[PDB]
Design a binder for this molecule. Structure first.
Ligand code: HEM
Ligand code: HEM
Ligand SMILES: CC(C)(C)OC(=O)N[C@@H](CS[C@H](Cc1ccccc1)C(=O)NCCCc1cccnc1)Cc1cccc2ccccc12
Ligand SMILES: CC(C)(C)OC(=O)N[C@@H](CS[C@H](Cc1ccccc1)C(=O)NCCCc1cccnc1)Cc1cccc2ccccc12
Lengths: 441, 457
């Protein structure tokens, strides 16, 4: 099954037996995609064990997979197991169950519901300033991932459940941990046949206590909102309701806080960009005025900085869809069962599409130059019917933190500040050493 | 009284007459009056359209402050235009929160993805444009460019915004074009558009008489045309976005037609007028026309069909379109109503004053452009484009209330110029007005229509 890309004429690295090309992941997913982007051109294929993966970079071919042929062919992502009761998660659901959950959780982040969350986040935006002021008046570098993690936890636990927590961050911080050095997930890539061995016999990849604590915490949350929508629509099951809460809690904590740490690093390493951003926030909101829903979307340089950070640090790295039947798109034959992959990290730094892609230049997303950006090359939230469902929720929650903090504090690098920031050469997109900076009031 | 405002503020300007103000100086038109004031009074001057004081600014920082920085807070709305009737809900006429809702609603109409989807549709009518140009070319005979460009522009804006192929082969007496033409006629000689400026108190009187600046013949026709243009069920164009957003709430039936008439008028008149000015400059400069044709053939050899990416690759084509818009900014002026007392760049502006940006005069300012009356596309080359201020050259405006169909118009015009210059070259005639005299009336148009010979290659 390792002569597939040799048959279809698609170039790619030579695979090893059983392993395939997973030994090239020693530098990470990002470095392997960028080296293959230069060696084999626009389209190449490799093997994650015995699973063939076709990598595409053509925007028209990307649009056909993500948007056009979504509901028809490229509907589901790579099979991820064994998950146990987490098989009902919207991000892991497949075919008919996904559409029922996508439509059920779509009214969660409308313009009406997002406008209701502004006063709720406005409460947590004050404790963030008061806690940073304790570390500001005292010469002491702040681990931004910590203080932003608590801010990211209170927002998703209140805007989705109405419960104020002020053990969840400890249990949530230990939900993923996708380390390729761990032979377990390196085995699932090599042994896709061991997934049915653990599904019929009830074995999961997530630790029991991070799933038992959340299944019992959601039951305490069930005091008869995003939770209010899942009860009024309840045919939704009770155990299925827990699986969706784990997805929202983890995304609202890990994704928003890690990107916020990426933003503050770029602002501290580029003073003229942070200073120009502070002058704009003081103009739209003078005297440290509380931000509203309209003043957030009005700040465009705030949008030009966030969109530039998401280009440099796409926490997704890759988008994946599984070909469910024999098709031919843009004059290329993709057989059934092939995982079509779109290297987001490699495309966000393609010299063919970006000038000086290494350097932090928010001028790429200016309304004068944003017309030169392909929407299928810059996909930090994906695209099509199966993109990020909390895209507008994440872009709002991160900007609300950037407004309220830059109105009161200014960030400078420290001695222990890793410059340049080296990304984690492992699995998920994170810095090697934690992001630490000095806070000046 | 009010005619002493600029005397009180120390701002120079022509001495106004009672009641009339300075409107008698419009005998040469908006453009000539603005350039003469810019030479005598300097960077800032003020005049009166009757009793309405108009402050003209030419400073790029002051222009950026009005158009970009202080749009949502102070300079949000244009000068009130009436009587308009139900067309007050149009995006270009809407004010304050109504415009802000409509702007965000119609913004996804012209994205890079939506525009790239329109190229195959525009490519269809590009082939029809070449066929009609080839009949008038196979036989020595002038060719009124405004007519053949007007039929092409109506074909593009109706199909890309509504999905309806209305003009088929022509139909040279097409009812859409015939009804949309009489939709714009600001003849300052007509007392109507001159008296309502002298008597602004008559606008609320005319609004209660159901009197509009648009004739009932063209509004009732377009009212039932858009209603019959709703066909379903069976894409996602301009019409589909308005129905999906129709289902705070919401978009009315009379509001959906108001925006459609705006998109129909802009896509027809503006695109066809600039194309006529472009071809006049190419015929009167055969060297520029040859260099542009050599670039189209280099990017699209063997008459290759134009695509979204090949259009953006042609630099000289972008330089020809930009230089023509510099000489002929169909906007002429940009205006914003100052809604509250402000002090920008060290100058006080009181509430109610209309801040005006003389775009026509700024595009021909000798202290910004070398030989401003000469047609030189080399100003917009990448070697010289850094010496161009984006607040002196504003053919599509600037800020949150600039031209919402800028990127569409730049594509529809370039897609037409490519497929036309691929097959034809244009030369002047005996009846071609050389030099071109602009209409001394209101809107920016030529005196005698642009007529040229069409030779095949
Ligand atoms: C900076 C913040 C975030 C980024 C960059 C991000 C990125 C992404 C990407 C790239 C995808 C997949 C798109 C595709 O496959 O085409 C995705 C899916 C998803 N995201 Fe996010 N995300 C963020 C925050 C959030 C938040 C706050 C939530 C809150 C619920 C969330 C919930 C989800 C879910 C449920 C899915 C799967 C939807 C489905 O499979 O149908 N994400 N995200
Ligand atoms: C060569 C072609 C065109 C030129 C030179 C042009 C120029 C302009 C200018 C200068 C403005 C005012 C900007 C400001 O006040 O700051 C404007 C506004 C506008 N234009 Fe265009 N335009 C063109 C074609 C089009 C097209 C094809 C459409 C299609 C819908 C369109 C729709 C509009 C609308 C709706 C506005 C008002 C926007 C608002 O009030 O928010 N225009 N145009
Ligand atoms: C795992 C691989 C990449 C081989 O196969 C997939 O593709 N399995 C997708 C589903 S595992 C995941 C389950 C999980 C993990 C850890 C804690 C809790 C649940 C999942 O539910 N995650 C989406 C929900 C939250 C989120 C995260 C980031 C951004 N927004 C929202 C993985 C997947 C889902 C969605 C977007 C992705 C982008 C890049 C890479 C993988 C993606
Ligand atoms: C009327 C004056 C100039 C004193 O006061 C304004 O300012 N009234 C603005 C709104 S009248 C117009 C209504 C109309 C007229 C004729 C047919 C159909 C509708 C309008 O809706 N037109 C914008 C939409 C179309 C368009 C036109 C040209 C370019 N692109 C798009 C006038 C106005 C609007 C937008 C840009 C302008 C530039 C220069 C001068 C005036 C402008």
């Amino acid at each position: 099954s390792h002569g597939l890309f040799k048959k279809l004429g698609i170039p790619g690295p030579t695979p090893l037996p059983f392993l395939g090309n997973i030994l090239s992941y020693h530098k990470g997913f990002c470095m392997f995609d960028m080296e293959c982007h230069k060696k084999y051109g626009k389209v190449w294929g490799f093997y994650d064990g015995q699973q063939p993966v076709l990598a595409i970079t053509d925007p028209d071919m990307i649009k056909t997979v993500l948007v056009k042929e979504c509901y028809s062919v490229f509907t589901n992502r790579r099979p991820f197991g064994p998950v146990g009761f987490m098989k009902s998660a919207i991000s892991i659901a497949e075919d008919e169950e996904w559409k029922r959950l996508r439509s059920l959780l779509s009214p969660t982040f409308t313009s009406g519901k997002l406008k209701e969350m502004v006063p709720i986040i406005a409460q947590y935006g004050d404790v963030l300033v008061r806690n940073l002021r304790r570390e500001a008046e005292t010469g002491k570098p702040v681990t931004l991932k910590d203080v932003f993690g608590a801010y990211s936890m209170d927002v998703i636990t209140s805007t989705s459940f109405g419960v104020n927590i002020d053990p969840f961050v400890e249990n949530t911080k230990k939900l993923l941990r996708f380390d390729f050095l761990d032979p377990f997930f390196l085995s699932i890539t090599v042994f896709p046949f061991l997934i049915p061995i653990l599904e019929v016999l009830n074995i999961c990849v997530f630790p029991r206590e991070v799933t038992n604590f959340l299944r019992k915490s959601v039951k305490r949350m069930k005091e008869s909102d995003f939770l209010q929508l899942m009860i009024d629509s309840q045919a939704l099951s009770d155990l299925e309701l827990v699986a969706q809460s784990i997805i929202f809690i983890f995304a609202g904590y890990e994704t928003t806080s890690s990107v916020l740490s990426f933003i503050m690093y770029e602002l501290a390493t580029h003073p003229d960009v942070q200073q120009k951003l502070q002058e704009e926030i003081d103009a739209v909101l003078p005297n440290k005025a509380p931000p509203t829903y309209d003043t957030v979307l009005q700040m465009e340089y705030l949008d030009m900085v966030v969109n530039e950070t998401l280009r440099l640090f796409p926490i997704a790295m890759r988008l994946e869809r599984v070909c469910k039947k024999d098709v031919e798109i843009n004059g290329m034959f993709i057989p059934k069962g092939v995982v079509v992959m779109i290297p987001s990290y490699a495309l966000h730094r393609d010299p063919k599409y970006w000038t000086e892609p290494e350097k932090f230049l928010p001028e790429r997303f200016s309304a004068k130059n944003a017309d030169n950006i392909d929407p299928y090359i810059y996909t930090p939230f994906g695209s099509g019917p199966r993109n990020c469902i909390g895209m507008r929720f994440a872009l709002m929650n991160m900007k609300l933190a950037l407004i309220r903090v830059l109105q009161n504090f200014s960030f400078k690098p420290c001695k222990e500040t890793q410059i340049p920031l080296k990304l984690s050469l492992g699995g998920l997109l994170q810095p090697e050493k934690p992001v630490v900076l000095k806070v000046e009031s």
